[PDB]
Design a protein around this ligand. Sequence first.
Ligand SMILES: [Mg+2]
Lengths: 354, 106, 44, 92, 144
Amino acid sequence: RRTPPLGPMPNSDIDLSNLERLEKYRSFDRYRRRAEQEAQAPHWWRTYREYFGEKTDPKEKIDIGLPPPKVSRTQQLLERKQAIQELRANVEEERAARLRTASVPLDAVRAEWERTCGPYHKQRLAEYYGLYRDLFHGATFVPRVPLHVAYAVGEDDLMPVYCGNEVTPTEAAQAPEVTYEAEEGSLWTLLLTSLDGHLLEPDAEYLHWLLTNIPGNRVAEGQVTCPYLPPFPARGSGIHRLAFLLFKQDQPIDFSEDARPSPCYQLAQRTFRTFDFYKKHQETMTPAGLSFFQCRWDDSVTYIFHQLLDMREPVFEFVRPPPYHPKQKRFPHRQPLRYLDRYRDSHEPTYGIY
Amino acid sequence: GGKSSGRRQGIKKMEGHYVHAGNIIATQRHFRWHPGAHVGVGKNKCLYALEEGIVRYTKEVYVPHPRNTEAVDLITRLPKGAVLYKTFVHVVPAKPEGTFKLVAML
Amino acid sequence: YKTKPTHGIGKYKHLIKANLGTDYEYGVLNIHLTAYDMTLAESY
Amino acid sequence: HLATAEWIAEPVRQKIAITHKNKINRLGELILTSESSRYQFRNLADCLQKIRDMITEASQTPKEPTKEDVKLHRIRIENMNRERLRQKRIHS
Amino acid sequence: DPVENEAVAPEFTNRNPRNLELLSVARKERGWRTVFPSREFWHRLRVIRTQHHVEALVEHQNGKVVVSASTREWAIKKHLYSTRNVVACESIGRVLAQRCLEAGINFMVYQPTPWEAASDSMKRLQSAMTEGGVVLREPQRIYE
Ligand SMILES: [Mg+2]
């Protein structure tokens, strides 16, 4: 019994009458490339990606970001081509290239990337970290404008918060310095959330900082809706992710409902969700910047828990499920003597009635 | 002579069967099936599960290792656009690695 | 499996190979290059 | 209570509070628990031996170049990377 | 008597995708011993050397791509003489190492064919990654 295939055969298109005329792969790299390109295509049979690959909703990922700016591709390409023309005409550059000793300015390339391709890479990195999934319950945003946050340690040292890096709570104890390009007439809002810092409700998250109505780049003059609170990731609970979000207000916004008393050391009051918050504010609020970083536990968390939060610090532990053993049989055939030690619970000797 | 008995070699766990770590999935004289995710192969081409989960069978693209000169030579002689396919057996883990629970309140 | 519609997906030897002169084309030809300069001969 | 306990030397108390800081609760009490056996006698003996081992370790204060754990390898790598990523202000 | 701040759930739920990887307890996709390359890793570094351009990707095992460094990008084109030479490979390696350091990823894997491994451009890329601080060996999973 044979059943016709439900789709085209993988090698049905290739003829075989003139297979000698057909050009061969003749190399492993070409076959590998064709193989991966084929594997990246949908199929009507069961495949690895069907069972292990993640599934996405058919609806397109909804965007809430700032509309893309326009630019003249022809002029951009002309300037780029003349720049590379003069660069290749420069003999010293060509000699360095042939000697394989040329070097590129890392700071310059990063600064140019932050304006050219930075937003898309940052969006992809945030999607990989899953922020868009947990908060917003599924949405997308492109960080059109850049933001730079630094925590001041010592008198000179700065710990930056670029994207998903590791910063200790000892460094994050004080309020950081925030910089972002802006001009007069723009109202900004800064928010900080701990995605995994919650201790009671897994779905909810803890708000740690909220500034509203920042005039331009004058961050200090902004209204302090909620005082800054350093992160408190519990020891043994893993690595948490703390997210800074910069939003823009087309109209002035009153923040009376979400206002928090100063100080706000209660976890129930610090409980917050960006979901339904961006829902109630989306009419007159729109994101412009996003950043985040990873955080572990350190000694400063103990002080924060004992004094700032006035509570006993909880300590967690990662524990694996107990090993599986089959149901014990009365006569274990051909099993080693240690078969009974697997089902014995205590290693101390027992004597029963005696 | 030649009075040998059968070797009882074949599939031991079908599609959708729940397996534990170390269980033999299939034994074979030659590589009829290929291991996939969390499936190990022994010296005698015996397939066992490295993780506890559900067994699945799929058709997957065959890309041999470069050091396998015989298979490299075999695949380098195919007409352009040809792709080899083979049956792979996978196990989908069911339980998480572990959980975090409160152990002390200091 | 043979019964399943994906039967034969694993076949590969039908894509691999298992002289008579026509009246329009020549079967086998040989081009011999003679030279006292071996380098030029092999280069050509 | 560690600090209040006068039957141990003050530097030993300080070293114990430093090293075994994860076993000190909010009130400053050092806590040691044992579940290694079914007998309260053996569990108490284990706790007392733990206390004695801590005291003698603080007394000896070894300074040998001990081996590096594989778990701490990636921790020190990421700490070095974070130190490298740390930045200085232009104007001081 | 009860304190609201001390009300903590018995089980902690952490949704960070990288927490298990950083704790070195996430299970790796072992197997695939009959095919190349192996999938037993958390992050993979892939190099695509085309006729005109060179690309480097750092991607997760489940399919997602973490970071990229491609010679088509203008911030490196404006300083790069040629996108298909050892200088281009060195620049790509350094830039990707810096991007990964900023993103927080430190450990990856590299699974080259023997010829591209012996290739001089790729070994200079490895040197660039090493000097940038990226380690191309992942820590072994902690089973127990
Ligand atoms: Mg017979």
